């Protein structure tokens, strides 16, 4: 019985592998023959935001491309006015271990998650004042690796218990639980249409989920180590994954296969955070060698090096308008690059 | 005008800077510790994470117990790299080999190669009664224990036969073999034996943290 089911599973795996191989006419390298090179990018630190006492584990941008939420292990959620290097809000956190922070698309809310297994949403705009907890979303068995707002009264969370969840904030109860990963989910990137979200786990696999139906449509398996960061390509049905194998890869949601492998002989350090530019031409990846990296997505070749951090580059985000890169790192400093 | 908004931003930033200065003092006052391997140590010290506070000689220590998570540790243990020490409790009675590889992984982890590990040998009386029995998990799963002699420097710890001493220090040197190899003053693995009837564990962690901070001072004060 069990052996028969395992044989059926092997047959199905071979079937999907054969289908993918048939659909594998070429790779993303097929366009790396005629596209003009992007040229050497040279972005300097346009500001260093020095308010954090510990490693900046995660950070996020607001839709205004001006405000900046940054999280660190001292127990702070600082909102930075990147234009004038001013700390608009300093939100103390109940639990100092925070691995993610999110900014609501319409402002007014900030969500932080970490080892506490809880996602807490803070009311930035307040009739009274004193930005405080609005809803303390609990229910995840393990820690929280990434929280992504989609609007008020809805949040999508990825946890280390191999499950992703969509929460209704006002009621405080889960709406849909996503299951199918066998490892700790690390990163979550919602689609621009905000109807799908991909997640990378510690089982060398990434899965596309439908936020409404609640099941996994496609499972992507191309890596040989834990996926540490994931990020949707702006739009075009693609996403990029950075792993601990010192390799970045680009997956297409429609072809259901990997397309590129951003790796080099020199690099042996994993990618902690991954992000994309507005055009999607540049893929920016933060490594463990205390140095961020710039990748031409269409032409796998490297085209930039954002050195300037003395420790692990933990988080890395690109503005919605595409005007800046705010790279947090364990050096307790956050730098904005043009 | 925009000058009013600029003044408002300056005032808000001034308040945040004062608050962050106070928080800077607080953060440099308290020391963070990670406990790996027990609730008994938490009981004698006085939810995905358990935050517990204690003070000895007016110094602030924070210990963190990962007590509602999975068995996978390769990702959430990286967050505990700025901690002063990683307290490691072992049964020290194959539990022991699994403990040895957990310790080895912590020692050889890229982000824990600056963090010393206060090994404690959480239980010792079970080891005493095991070697009294003889056929328990002392000699069968570790043949070299029979072919090993108690080192001279080992304190007798009165109240026990030489067999208890040799088995105890055998597990201690089994844990110290990984510690000595591929390890320098960056992290030292202070070895200790745990007494559940006494509160010396807090004092010993205090002394180890004192030595750790003294080493970081020697390094940052260029006394080397």
């Amino acid at each position, epitope marked *: 019985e069990l052996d028969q089911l395992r044989q059926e599973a092997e047959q199905l795996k071979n079937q999907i592998r054969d289908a993918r191989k048939a659909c594998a006419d070429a790779t993303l390298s097929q366009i790396t023959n005629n596209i003009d090179p992007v040229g050497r990018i040279q972005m300097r630190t346009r500001r260093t935001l020095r308010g954090h006492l510990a490693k900046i584990y995660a950070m996020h941008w607001g839709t205004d491309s001006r405000l900046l939420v940054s999280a660190s292990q001292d127990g702070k959620l600082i909102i930075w006015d990147s234009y004038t290097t001013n700390k608009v809000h300093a939100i103390p956190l109940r639990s100092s271990w925070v691995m993610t922070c999110a900014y609501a698309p319409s402002g007014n809310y900030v969500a932080c998650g970490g080892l506490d297994n809880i996602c807490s949403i803070y009311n930035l705009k307040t009739r009274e004042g004193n930005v405080r907890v609005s809803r303390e979303l609990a229910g995840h068995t393990g820690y929280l690796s990434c929280c992504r707002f989609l609007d008020d009264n809805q949040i999508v969370t990825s946890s280390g218990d191999t499950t992703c969840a969509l929460w209704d904030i006002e009621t405080g109860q889960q709406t849909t639980t996503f299951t199918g990963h066998t490892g700790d989910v690390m990163s979550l990137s919602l689609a621009p249409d905000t109807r799908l979200f991909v997640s990378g786990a510690c089982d060398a696999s990434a899965k596309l989920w439908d936020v409404r139906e609640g099941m996994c449509r496609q499972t992507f398996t191309g890596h040989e180590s834990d996926i540490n960061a994931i990020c949707f390509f702006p739009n075009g049905n693609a996403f990029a994954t950075g792993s601990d*194998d010192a390799t970045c890869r680009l997956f297409d949601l429609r072809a259901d296969q990997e397309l590129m492998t951003y790796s080099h002989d020199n690099i042996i350090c994993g990618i902690t955070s991954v992000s994309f530019s507005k055009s999607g031409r540049l893929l920016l990846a933060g490594y463990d060698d205390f140095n961020c990296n710039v990748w031409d997505a269409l032409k796998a070749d490297r085209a930039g090096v954002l050195a300037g951090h003395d420790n692990r580059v933990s988080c890395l985000g690109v503005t919605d308008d595409g005007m800046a890169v705010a790279t947090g790192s364990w050096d307790s400093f956050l730098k904005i690059w043009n | 005008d925009q000058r009013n908004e600029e003044k408002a931003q300056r005032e808000a930033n001034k308040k945040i800077e004062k608050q962050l200065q106070k928080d800077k003092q607080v953060y440099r006052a308290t020391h963070r510790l990670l406990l790996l391997g027990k609730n008994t140590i938490v009981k004698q010290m006085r939810s995905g994470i358990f935050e517990t506070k204690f003070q000895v000689d007016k110094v602030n220590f924070h210990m963190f117990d990962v007590g509602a998570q999975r068995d996978e540790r390769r990702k959430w243990i990286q967050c505990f790299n700025d901690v002063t020490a990683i307290i490691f409790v072992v049964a020290s009675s194959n539990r022991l080999q*699994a403990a040895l590889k957990l310790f*080895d992984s912590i020692w050889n982890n890229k982000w824990l190669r600056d963090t010393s590990v206060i090994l404690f040998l959480n239980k010792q009386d079970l080891l005493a009664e095991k070697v009294l029995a003889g056929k328990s998990k002392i000699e069968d799963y570790f043949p070299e224990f029979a072919r090993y002699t108690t080192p001279e420097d080992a304190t007798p710890e009165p109240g026990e036969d030489p067999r208890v001493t040799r088995a105890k220090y055998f597990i201690r040197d089994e844990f110290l073999r990984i510690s000595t190899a591929s390890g320098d003053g960056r992290h030292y693995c202070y070895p200790h034996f745990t007494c559940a009837v006494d509160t010396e564990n807090i004092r010993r962690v205090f002394n180890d943290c004192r030595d750790i901070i003294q080493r970081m001072h020697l390094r940052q004060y260029e006394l080397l």
Partner: nanobody
Amino acid sequence: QVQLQESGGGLVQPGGSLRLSCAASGFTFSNYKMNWVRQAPGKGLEWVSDISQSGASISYTGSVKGRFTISRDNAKNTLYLQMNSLKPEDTAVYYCARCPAPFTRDCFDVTSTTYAYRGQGTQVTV
């Protein structure tokens, strides 16, 4: 995907000998500290052996000390194990486990019940 397909085993009387290899088709096989872990009937996963990237660094536990050999043939992408002087101790599903990350010498988790790269073990009844 990362595949660890065990082979060999069957049945053998006490004092016999077997061998078992693990084909790998997902990772490099040269920069991972591969190792053997077993679950005896009625017990959890317990460590047996371990070989490093070069193959020079080699470790065992007490029960398998001197009676087990690890080969780590890089060309064949198969981690072998020469089982000698067998006792009823094994009677387990021997499966191979890979290091979580390459270019590291700290296999942090191998004994977890749901670790991603452990394979489907083959029974060795003795």
